[PDB]
Structure 1
Amino acid sequence: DEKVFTKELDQWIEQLNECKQLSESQVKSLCEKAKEILTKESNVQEVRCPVTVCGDVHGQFHDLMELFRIGGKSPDTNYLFMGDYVDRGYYSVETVTLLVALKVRYRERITILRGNHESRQITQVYGFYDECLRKYGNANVWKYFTDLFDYLPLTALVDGQIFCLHGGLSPSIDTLDHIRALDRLQEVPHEGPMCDLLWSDPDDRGGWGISPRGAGYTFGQDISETFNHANGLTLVSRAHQLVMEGYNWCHDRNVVTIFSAPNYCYRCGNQAAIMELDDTLKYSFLQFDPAPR
């Protein structure tokens, strides 16, 4: 039963390692199982170090394969990918399938956050829906993956010090208790604390300000400092803004912007970075440029 299913899942893992998407029935059975495996994790799904934090992916399968080459194979090096891994990529379906497959195979060797782009509305008008219709013909898999995207956690806490979340802080939210009390079984609303968490970002301003993205806000140095004092956090890690060094510090070593999708849209040519924390919370950094194709 469980044993034979585990071996069957192994075949799916190795196949996805070969860029070969699963059958529609297999996708259905995967999503069904993943619902029961994600239902048990609260908003701040605490994860113990060591860890390897990975920034934005945007479903670039070659890049993800090189990222595995760099950091290590999933069963060995624990990972904490942060969102936006379904859009603006010609292999988004394969990427998301691989991520969810790894999550279901290993409950705690990996953990995936929910980015702004994992919702019903955004995917329809940013490719993923089109990709699914082209590949599988119909939209059954689409209505499976979009349904799954709601059950993802919202933020991760590493040894009570590092706070990893895709977007950033929000004027409504102030404490981890509020995040824990937030309800996630809801397509990201267009305005609200949940909305902003997936569209926030840093800036050298101070105070607050309407984000040019049209959703969420933009926080300042003092806001991040005050929030860190409020809850004893020592560093927040987000990945929503494309960068060049791959990892950039802001707010005087308070928020780290990570981005692990090199050469965004195949044309930016930006490098990509990955952060890794050893057992003694000894951060490091690795950089890379996409593998030859």
Structure 2
Amino acid sequence: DEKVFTKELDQWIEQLNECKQLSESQVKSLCEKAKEILTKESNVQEVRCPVTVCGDVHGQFHDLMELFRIGGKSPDTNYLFMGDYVDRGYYSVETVTLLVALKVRYRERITILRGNHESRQITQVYGFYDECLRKYGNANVWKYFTDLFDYLPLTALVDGQIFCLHGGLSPSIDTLDHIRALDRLQEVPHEGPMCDLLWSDPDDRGGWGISPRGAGYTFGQDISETFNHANGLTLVSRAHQLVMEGYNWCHDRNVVTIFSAPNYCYRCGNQAAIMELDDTLKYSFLQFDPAPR
């Protein structure tokens, strides 16, 4: 009864791992599973170290692989991604399909969070959507996936000490309990805590500022500092902005950004990097260049 599936996923992955999309009928099947498995998780996912924090990937499949040649591979090495799986890149499908396959399999070896892009609207607007058609003919694998996205947890807490979220801090959110009460089982709203969490950024203008993006706000040193001190956070790890250098510290080593998509959109000539939290939460960063294609 147990060897009637866990043996098959192993294959699904082997396949995607060679960069060949699963079949429609198969996507749904995969997502269904991923569902049940994701329902059960909180909104502020508590996962114990040691792990590796990975930021944005944006369908850049090959550069994803490169990442893996750096931080090791699953399940051998623990991971934690912070949204933005699709869009921009040329191989969205494959990428997400994969990461999800991994979650449905090595259930506790990888942790994926929702990003400003796991939303129908942006996926339509910025790419993913079309790619689905372009590759599957209909627009079902899109639905199938846009729905899985809703069950993705919004944040992560490593050893109660480090906070993780795609975007950032929200006025409407003071505590971590203020987050466990929310209802993420819905499409990313245009305004509100949830939305903010996936859109908010770090600023040097001090104190909450209106975001020139269109959603979320621009918290600052003060804001950060209080947050940490409040809930008992030693570091807030987000990553939602292209940092030309792969990762960046700000607000006085309080909050850090980590872009994992190298040379972003295959245009932005930036470095990308990931952060490895060890057995005793130690900051060790690894910068990497776009995989020779």
Normalised by the length of structure 1, the TM-score is: 0.99
SS in 1 for 2:157: strand
Q: Deviations over 1:1-40 (max 9, x none)?
A: 3212111111111010111111111111101111111110
Per-residue deviation at 1:170?
0.6
Specify every segment of 5 or more residues in structure 1 that has no aligned partner in the other structure, as ranges. none
In the aligned structure 2, how far is the partner of 1:195 from the partner of 1:268?
26
In the aligned structure 2, how far is the partner of 1:23 from the partner of 1:64?
21
In the aligned structure 2, how far is the partner of 1:117 from the partner of 1:291?
23
SS in 2 for 1:81: strand
Matches within 5 A, 1:238-277: 238-277=238-277
SS in 2 for 1:80: strand
Q: Deviations over 1:236-268 (max 9, x none)?
A: 011111012211100000010101111011121
Per-residue deviation at 1:140?
1.2
Q: Deviations over 1:126-156 (max 9, x none)?
A: 1101000110000111110001000000000
Q: Deviations over 1:76-97 (max 9, x none)?
A: 1101011111110110001000
In the aligned structure 1, how far is the partner of 2:184 from the partner of 2:219?
23
SS in 1 for 2:275: strand
In the aligned structure 2, how far is the partner of 1:145 from the partner of 1:285?
31
Per-residue deviation at 1:281?
1.3
SS in 1 for 2:243: coil
CA contact (8 A) 2:89 2:266 kept: no
In the aligned structure 2, how far is the partner of 1:283 from the partner of 1:209?
29
In the aligned structure 2, how far is the partner of 1:7 from the partner of 1:164?
32
In the aligned structure 2, how far is the partner of 1:171 from the partner of 1:34?
31
SS in 2 for 1:52: strand
In the aligned structure 2, how far is the partner of 1:66 from the partner of 1:32?
29
Q: Deviations over 1:24-63 (max 9, x none)?
A: 1111110111111111001111000001001111110011
In the aligned structure 1, how far is the partner of 2:83 from the partner of 2:37?
18
In the aligned structure 2, how far is the partner of 1:54 from the partner of 1:136?
28
Percentage identity across paired residues of the two chains: 100
In the aligned structure 1, how far is the partner of 2:199 from the partner of 2:149?
17
Q: Deviations over 1:67-113 (max 9, x none)?
A: 01111111111010111111101100010001000000111100100
- Pair 1:156-2:143 in alignment: no
SS in 2 for 1:3: coil
Q: Which runs of 4+ in 1 moved over 3 A?
A: none
In the aligned structure 2, how far is the partner of 1:81 from the partner of 1:94?
16
Q: What is the aligned-residue RMSD (CA, Å)?
A: 0.8
SS in 2 for 1:171: coil
SS in 2 for 1:198: helix
The equivalent residue for 1:72 is 72
In the aligned structure 2, how far is the partner of 1:292 from the partner of 1:284?
24
